[PDB]
Design a protein around this ligand. Structure first.
Ligand code: DPM
Length: 312
């Protein structure tokens, strides 16, 4: 029963999947693997029993996975922050010291809404194409003075050098599960679920449960004006959540916390699409409540309206 690992053809995808397989081979020295190169296709490959596990970016996974599927692992989180990559002429500058009316590229409502609010005198225009395509556009064509990208993506590509500015939460908060990898497996597949569990990082898991619960209870998806920020320090788990109108004019930003001691290891159902029976459920549950609490606190202040309008 050799471990078949489904992956997209794109360079970044294949890199991410490799780092996972690499970590599985560290815990299971001899264990044999096999890599097999609009992500529903891979999901269909899980159903056809062609593939055994697929590696996703957490933020690209629905808060509710299709019946039969589950997230078997939340890997250690990389850098969650958003980053700015400047045009060569503006190298050395910050969004804060850019010429007024400078066009910054981004096809992210979350990023756009937040940055129009903190940088009113900068124009935020959408930009399309993979991470490389956008870099061709930023450099060659004369339109964008800068672009916005996830720090974690540049780091995996080895484009760390191109990072011009690491955006703080007080300027732009990250998408839920940004910078963290999720391993998607069949829920009725206890064997794979057992192996893959080594990949669970406790802190990251609790944090991404808070973030996904929160997003889930706002009935939000991948492309909605919703950002978060989580941190664990001395027993406490901190959650900060916010919503914005497409233009970031009206906003709601709140923070709640839960006393959740960060766990050691070990039939209950998954949480926000995540199976993790190998780590204590008390904290997982407790982190979910955090999401729910904050989500309700934002709804109590008309978050739903802001979101319904945001939907074009
Ligand atoms: C949900 C999601 N997925 C991706 C696209 C995506 N998905 C995963 C990564 C890399 C980091 C990661 O894997 O967490 C990226 C690229 C990026 O965020 O710069 C974007 C950004 C699209 C854009 O650039 O306008 C968003 C929206 C958001 O984050 O608010």
């Amino acid at each position: 029963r050799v471990i078949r690992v489904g992956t997209r053809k794109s360079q970044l995808a294949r890199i991410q999947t490799d780092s996972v397989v690499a970590t599985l081979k560290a815990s299971y020295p001899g264990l044999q693997f096999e890599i097999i190169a609009f992500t529903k296709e891979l999901e269909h490959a899980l159903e056809k029993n062609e593939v055994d596990l697929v590696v996703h970016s957490l933020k690209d996974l629905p808060t509710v996975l299709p019946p039969g599927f589950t997230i078997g692992a939340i890997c250690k989180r990389e850098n969650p922050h958003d980053a700015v990559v400047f045009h060569p002429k503006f190298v050395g500058k910050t969004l804060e010291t850019l010429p007024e009316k400078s066009v910054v590229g981004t096809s992210s409502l979350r990023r756009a809404a937040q940055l129009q609010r903190k940088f009113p005198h900068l124009e935020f225009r959408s930009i399309q194409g993979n991470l490389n395509t956008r870099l061709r556009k930023l450099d060659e064509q004369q339109e964008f003075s800068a672009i916005i990208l996830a720090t974690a993506g540049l780091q995996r590509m080895g484009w760390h050098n191109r990072v011009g500015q690491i955006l703080h939460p007080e300027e732009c908060m990250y998408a839920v599960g940004q910078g963290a990898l999720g391993v998607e497996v069949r829920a009725k597949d206890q064997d794979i679920l057992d192996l893959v569990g080594v990949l669970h990082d406790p802190e990251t898991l609790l944090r991404c449960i808070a973030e996904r619960a929160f997003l889930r209870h706002l009935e939000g998806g991948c492309s909605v004006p919703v950002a978060v920020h989580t941190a664990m320090k001395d027993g406490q788990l901190y959650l900060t959540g916010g919503v914005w109108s497409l233009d970031g004019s009206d906003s709601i930003q709140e923070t709640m916390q839960a006393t959740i001691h960060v766990p050691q290891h070990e039939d209950d159902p998954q949480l926000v699409g995540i199976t993790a029976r190998n780590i204590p459920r008390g904290p997982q549950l407790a982190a979910q409540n955090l999401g729910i609490s904050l989500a309700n606190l934002l709804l109590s202040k008309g978050a739903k309206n802001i979101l319904d309008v945001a939907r074009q």
